[PDB]
Design a binder for this molecule. Structure first.
Ligand SMILES: [Mn+2]
Ligand SMILES: [Mn+2]
Ligand SMILES: [Mn+2]
Ligand SMILES: [Mn+2]
Ligand SMILES: [Mn+2]
Ligand SMILES: [Mn+2]
Ligand SMILES: [Zn+2]
Ligand SMILES: [Zn+2]
Lengths: 184, 368, 368, 184
DNA sequence: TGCGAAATTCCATGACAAT
DNA sequence: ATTGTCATGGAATTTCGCA
DNA sequence: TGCGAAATTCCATGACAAT
DNA sequence: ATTGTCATGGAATTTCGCA
């Protein structure tokens, strides 16, 4: 069998609802399977049409051979199925209640939720503006397994924003207290 | 003046007046019989006024001024006095065209890496499509890979919104642009400083300098036009299509598409190249680094028969940018402070601000 | 299609498929191992659809279309099928630029006599001066002698008023002009027929054809600009001055002024030439006839490396005159009915009207 | 002495008043002395300023060395004298009551008045429009003395409007009757 | 039948434009 | 059913002045 | 080690423009 | 404180297929 490649497979999922930021409530998350590169798109709903709208942006840059998701309503609709067929994209579902992907992807997805949570706290409504810097962060994060960042694997160069501080990701004493406040 | 003319009348040799001619007097005027006929020799003290009257009839150049003068007068080295006057007629200097071409263009090195340098620019106004009038075009200098954004105005705010989305992917070292209000605003400067992005600007009125993106604008409008043939010009929905289409088009000289130069592998688009199917990603990126370094690069063309290149201290004139009706096309002479490169100079515009300026917008002042 | 492909699979030679290659079968598709790798050989019946899908991604030309196709397929003489498609893509044919230059310009003979041919034209709009916005320019083809008239509009009525004053002096055989409303009106046609004046028109959008007068417009604006430097642009009162000034300016290549070519003797203006003071008028006119016949005449320049000249029956395309945003710059192909001269043709525009048209506004349709 | 030349001397004079034609009442007449070429300008008055205005047109084409006239008020004013001085034109006057010029000029001037009279009659108000064709006529009229028309002497070529019919210039029976009517 | 300098000629460059 | 033109000022070439 | 045809490369042409 | 670019399709050149 042939070595894994970028664009071979995109893993997608929704995160949310979140506090409203500039009208938006969810994040559609796309992770390339080979590289672990992440794209994020803010949406107002986890619907087929918000999905199509966002993916239409992404697929203007690059088209996956396969999209993998859970059996979310957005992803199993016949509209979404026709959209993918039009673009030659094969759709692929984890079985219900049994989410599955890859170690790299799972961990990547873990990092994404933690990092969001970490920056949400203190300013839970300002995340829309932070979405760009979050992606740079994720994508310029060194992988223990592969010896490269997603940026390096996707483009074959070093980046102009290395993230030299592999940071906490865990909440400080202060934030735990005030994220406990928010969740009240 | 009339002293020199006196000596001459009694046959004593003066330098410049050929001895073999008969210099006489008549009607109070010194004359001479020349092969062309009999001409008046005015005294030195009358000559500049004469050259000026002749020149001023129609503000004529060297020969056309001389032919007037020569109808009545002769004296030694007339064209020298003619040229002296042309070099001091302010109206001629700022109104006449140049007849010296610019020196041959530079072919600047292609950026070494994707994201080293972006070239950005606006296209429009276009026919309104869903409220949108303009397209922000961002071209990666190394790869040619291009991003497109519809806007309602070519504004700083629209630019910042779009580049915030783009820079989600990566941050570039340099962004090169022209002097459009949207790129020269302090707000945009802040946006870039906040991100470690260095702003680079074209010399004014010289789109050749933004050539990478201008050229891409052409391909963008061309494909848009074709896709809209016999439909109404509803172009907003075609932007994503055109973006993808051009990013995956081969340049015949390179044998690569901008997509390939950016990623080293085709995504799931029609006719995807499959030659590196058996390589690992690492082997693929290795071959990509090699391909990047050995891309064809054009060389500076031959200078035209009559070009000029700037020298420090030279008197040169900058083209007036938007001259009003019946107004001069050139500014007053100014001096070359520094030669940045053979196509770019700093001039002291005798106000005097320092201006960085293309030689395409300069002429060397005539008659030294 | 699949018949040809069948024979090939059992090793029997087909013309076009090189024998030395191994043509096998796999996944239901005929394939071949080529130096570049393994390619699918589609049946003849699939090829045009393939070439079309590849071409349509970005409406690419020969090589850029081929490089797409070659990623998946091989077959004999692919570019022939590619070129066949380019030659039938309507959108490409009317949208692409030409890459063939026009053949070298003609240098038509100078009119033999003053009043044989006038070239007329309007300059403007200029900044308002005493209510006037335009200048009617009349240039005598033989002499270059020029008359100037201020008007409030570039109208037939203003033109007729001015030429009635001018034709008080003499009536010309021909008046050449462009296709401005003022010259193509039936009223102006009547005015000329009433006087035995033949009207000649330039091919449309080709001011080179009115080159004599366009060129004079340049000198007119240039002198006006100079005389108005640092004053307000009150040009109405300068028209008479500029007229006289230019009519009495030497052309360096000719060694004569237009005034001299018209009358054979300077009037009472500054620096009047006096070389024929001792000739009788008859002797003067005699020398004038001689001078007129021996004026320098330029020759047609060398053709550029890659020019085209029209041949009767050729498919060519006329440039769209004022194309809207995002619309094609070229009309549909049309046919050369008659070659009037190597720079001028009559085309049947497939409506079909006959149009007389400059080759500068034509491209030869690509791919035959 | 040197042979006579065009532009050597312009003879000028007023004719009128005439019936009003499009507001105009007089004709300023200029005849080049050497060639006999005629220029005509309609004016509203025989004043210095109408003279200057008209001559400014003519002297935009060609400048006489000398202008000759009678002692008409228009021509003897200090304004007219300054105008000529500015242009390097010498002014020259016939003595009062003793008009003088040249045979060619006198005859030319005779022809002009006769031809006008001839065309005035029948349509005495339409002369403004006829001024052009009148000049062509005069200027393409063969000279008995010199063997050429003014056109030929001025330009050194044949013209595109030869006036092959050296016409009557004398009034027919009908016109004498109806010019006698007009003068009533 | 020759030299240095002046005069003339050559000629690339650019700007006039256009239903 | 017609078609490029020509002022400009450095350079290249010719002529002039002298011997 | 040479030929005819196909494939590739070369490259003049033109169009993107601009406080 | 900077700098032209590159798709296009005939032509010119190289390579391919065969012997
Ligand atoms: Mn989910
Ligand atoms: Mn711009
Ligand atoms: Mn016009
Ligand atoms: Mn009188
Ligand atoms: Mn014009
Ligand atoms: Mn631009
Ligand atoms: Zn001047
Ligand atoms: Zn096409």
């Amino acid at each position: 069998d042939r070595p894994q490649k970028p664009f071979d497979k995109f893993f997608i999922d929704y995160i949310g609802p979140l506090p409203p930021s500039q009208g938006y409530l969810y994040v559609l998350v796309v992770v390339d399977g080979m590289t672990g590169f992440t794209w994020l798109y803010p949406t107002k709903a986890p619907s087929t049409s918000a999905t199509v709208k966002s993916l239409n942006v992404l697929t203007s840059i690059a088209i996956p051979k396969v999209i993998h998701s859970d059996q979310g309503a957005a992803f199993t609709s016949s509209t979404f199925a026709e959209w993918a067929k039009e673009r030659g994209i094969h759709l692929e579902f984890s079985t219900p209640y049994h989410p599955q992907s890859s170690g790299k992807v799972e961990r990547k997805n873990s990092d994404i939720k933690r990092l969001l949570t970490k920056l949400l706290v203190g300013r839970p409504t300002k995340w829309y503006d932070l979405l760009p810097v979050v992606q740079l962060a994720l994508n310029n994060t060194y992988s223990p397994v592969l010896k490269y960042t997603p940026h390096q694997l996707l483009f074959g160069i070093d980046s102009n924003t290395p993230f030299a501080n592999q940071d906490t990701l865990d909440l400080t004493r202060e934030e735990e207290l005030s994220l406990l406040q928010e969740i009240r | 003046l009339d002293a020199e003319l006196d000596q001459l009348l009694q046959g004593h040799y003066i330098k410049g007046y050929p001895k073999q001619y008969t210099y006489f007097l008549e009607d109070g005027k010194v004359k001479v019989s020349r092969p062309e006929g009999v001409k008046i020799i005015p005294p030195q003290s009358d000559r500049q006024k004469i050259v000026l009257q002749a020149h001023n009839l129609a503000h004529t150049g060297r020969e056309a001024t001389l032919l007037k003068i020569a109808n009545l007068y002769w004296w030694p080295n007339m064209r020298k006095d003619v040229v002296k006057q042309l070099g001091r007629c302010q109206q001629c200097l700022i109104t006449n065209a140049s007849n010296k071409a610019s020196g041959p263009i530079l072919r600047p090195d292609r950026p070494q890496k994707p994201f080293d340098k972006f070239f950005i620019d606006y296209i429009g106004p276009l026919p309104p499509s869903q409220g949108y009038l303009y397209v922000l075009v961002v071209v990666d200098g190394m790869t040619g890979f291009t991003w497109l954004y519809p806007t309602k105005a070519p504004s700083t705010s629209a630019t910042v919104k779009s580049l915030n989305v783009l820079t989600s992917i990566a941050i570039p070292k340099v962004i090169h642009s022209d002097q459009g209000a949207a790129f020269t605003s302090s707000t945009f400067a802040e946006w870039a400083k906040e991100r470690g992005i260095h702003l680079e600007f074209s010399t004014p009125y010289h789109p050749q300098s933004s050539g990478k993106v201008e050229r891409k604008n052409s391909d963008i409008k061309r494909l848009l036009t074709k896709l809209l043939v016999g439909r109404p010009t509803k172009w907003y929905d075609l932007l994503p299509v055109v973006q993808l289409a051009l990013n995956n088009t081969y340049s015949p000289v390179l044998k690569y598409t901008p997509h390939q130069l950016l990623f080293g592998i085709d995504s799931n688009t029609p006719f995807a190249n499959q030659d590196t199917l058996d390589l690992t990603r690492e082997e693929e990126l290795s071959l990509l680094q090699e391909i990047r370094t050995s891309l064809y690069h054009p060389s500076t063309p031959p200078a035209s028969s009559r070009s000029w290149s700037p020298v420090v201290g030279q008197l040169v004139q900058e083209r007036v940018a938007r001259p009003a009706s019946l107004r001069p096309r050139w500014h007053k002479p100014s001096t070359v402070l520094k030669v940045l490169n053979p196509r770019t100079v700093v001039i002291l515009d005798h106000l005097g601000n320092n201006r960085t300026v293309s030689i395409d917008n300069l002429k060397p002042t005539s008659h030294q």
